[PDB]
Amino acid sequence: SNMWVIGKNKAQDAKAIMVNGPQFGWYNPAYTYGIGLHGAGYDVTGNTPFAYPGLLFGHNGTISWGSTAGAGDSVDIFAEKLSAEKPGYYQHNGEWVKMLSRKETIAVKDGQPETFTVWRTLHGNVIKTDTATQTAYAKARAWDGKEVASLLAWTHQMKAKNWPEWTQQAAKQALTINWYYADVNGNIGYVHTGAYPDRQPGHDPRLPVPGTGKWDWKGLLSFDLNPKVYNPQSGYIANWNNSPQKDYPASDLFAFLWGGADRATEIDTILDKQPRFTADQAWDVIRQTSRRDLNLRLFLPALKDATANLAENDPRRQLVDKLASWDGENLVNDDGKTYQQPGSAILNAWLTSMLKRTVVAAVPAPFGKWYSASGYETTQDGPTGSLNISVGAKILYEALQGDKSPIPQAVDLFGGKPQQEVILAALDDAWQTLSKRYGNDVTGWKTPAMALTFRANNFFGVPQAAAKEARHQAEYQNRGTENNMIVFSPTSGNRPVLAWDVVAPGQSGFIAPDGKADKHYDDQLKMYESFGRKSLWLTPQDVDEHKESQEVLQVQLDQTEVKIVRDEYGMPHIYADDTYRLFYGYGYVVAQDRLFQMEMARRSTQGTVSEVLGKAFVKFDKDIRQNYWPDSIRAQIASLSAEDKSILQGYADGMNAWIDKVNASPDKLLPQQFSTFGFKPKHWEPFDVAMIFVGTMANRFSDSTSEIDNLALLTALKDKYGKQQGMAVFNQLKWLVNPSAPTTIAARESAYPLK
Ligand SMILES: [Ca+2]
What we know:
Layout: E1 2-6, E2 16-21, E3 32-39, E4 42-49, E5 57-59, E6 63-68, E7 75-81, E8 89-92, E9 95-98, E10 100-106, E11 114-120, E12 125-130, E13 135-141, H1 147-156, H2 163-170, E14 177-183, E15 188-193, E16 197-198, E17 209-210, E18 219-220, E19 228-230, E20 236-239, H3 265-271, H4 279-290, H5 296-306, H6 315-324, H7 343-357, H8 359-362, H9 391-401, H10 419-438, E21 452-454, E22 471-473, E23 483-488, E24 497-502, H11 525-529, E25 534-535, H12 540-545, E26 547-554, E27 561-567, E28 572-575, H13 579-606, H14 610-613, H15 618-626, H16 630-638, H17 642-664, H18 666-669, H19 672-677, H20 686-701, H21 707-721, H22 723-733
Parallel strand pairs: 3-28, 7-17
Antiparallel strand pairs: 1-2, 1-20, 2-23, 3-4, 4-5, 5-6, 6-14, 7-13, 8-9, 10-11, 12-13, 14-15, 15-19, 16-18, 21-22, 23-24, 24-25, 26-27, 27-28
Helix pairs in contact: 5-6, 5-10, 7-10, 13-17, 13-20, 17-20, 21-22
Bound molecules: calcium ion.
The site of calcium ion (CA) has 7 residues, from strand 7.
């Protein structure tokens, strides 16, 4: 996910420009949902994943907001001490405490149901038990018990009118997500939001800690410690999942590092090349970053040095000369099947061989496979997400930096051989593989282009459309699933704010019972491919002047009415006087546009897929249920104020109003996928609405830990290199922090005070 926010000192013909590209993968229907909300203190326009009540990408006429992933470490594993004589108990503060447990039955269509038990301790749900060590591993998330408050913070931030009001809501968002701000006066800001644990001294957050009491978190760190910047000296804020600030620690995933090699550097390269950017030029950064090879910049210097004394008749030199003449941008040939230059294929073959000879060889099996990917992995459908510099390549980059790297090289990744020798041997391997495939003339190689697919299964691997609904795009683009831009105080025109976005394939996922797709089913697919965009309207006049339809909706609870206006792309705008009715309108239009997608997202987030799709989803459903505690979510909802509850209740009741119409006339209104998969939609409750957000936001971007696997790697490293060198090699592959990491906030603004 990327973002660039350009302030008054860096914007041309405007006071601020915000361009966001969240990367969630590609799907049909669209991952995000376009919506405008007008009333009850809200006046917003934008789009948001799974139609959450809170819009992730949009503006209110005064401020605009966005987000990117890039988790720090807010998830730890507590190794609970068990008793052979007291099963279901664990030791805490000198006593045997009983675990909570719940029974769950997975109903299976045309199959056999399965019952299992989910266990939970004061640290969290149990994710693994180990007989030999009498341990039950419990997953502690700093945001546990704050899932519903996080959803409400994302909704209430839409009403903020300045930096202090907005940061007040940012402090209430507990998931580890980057938040961005821009406003009508040209101010820009960033907050790396999230609840973070205040750990005991000596707690290494990359590995499990005993759950017996001594290692319990002291509590949560203050919001004063969350990285933030307002109007940075640079005049811009850029991010591509990289570190928020100097010395800020990343999540403990062995596959995730913030090091000297980072793709975010590519955005800074573009933004620093000219003093100011217009709205069109800021949008054009999407085209440029989408086509950038991320590895050329990192490895070309070492490749040129290794081949410096080779003659042009040497194939190793021919490969490097081809990379040296390349601008590093990938373009597709007229055939729509091959790249104009072979550079990425050459880097893939070389980097794959380099990793095998360096990082992979230094790590004992079976852990070498964690560092073997080059970053170019793809299928005929193309990459399922963004392209990044691989974890193996990041570690190799530090080794190539030598003394310039701040990471101590506890093990020489080159194994005693000079770095030029290994680089040349990898070039020999790449030459053998590539010349066998394309012949010996590198100037004529037509390497395959990566393609892009809007998948019919959602990110969980669960159908949200029929298989024939997959859509194809010839050119893979390393960009947001959606892209949106807000321009504040443009000098041209009479509007104080302009906004655009692209929600592909379309606003609607509706396919009628007879197979007829809605007119807004795929009318944004060509616009997506060509880097186009459509206007987002906010004011009643702009919405009215660009409308395709207008209607009134009678609220089932009291027969009052809300107004819904849809724009020329089918995007709905809700007009209501209070929270309950505003969110009722929202729920209703979501049920009209995305009912099958939302019903499948509801089943995905609650682990109730097998009930309708059969035995194929049983272990998926079990894994979902093991990873949450419904009583916690229900208790959080029960304790809400009437006003906060009205958001969820209004939304569910609104969906229900349309579901009632669908079920009374299914021959005309039932989305075709319900007939294809053989079931009917049923009513929603506030719990269902909360679980769309918990299951697709909290569990997708804020529930990452590999501490158990990290411990197994550390154990194997100590077996191979000894206790001392083994821990130092662990620090080289999975450093806590790397001061050379490119950061969103410049070191001169602020650094992380915790060491
Ligand atoms: Ca951790």
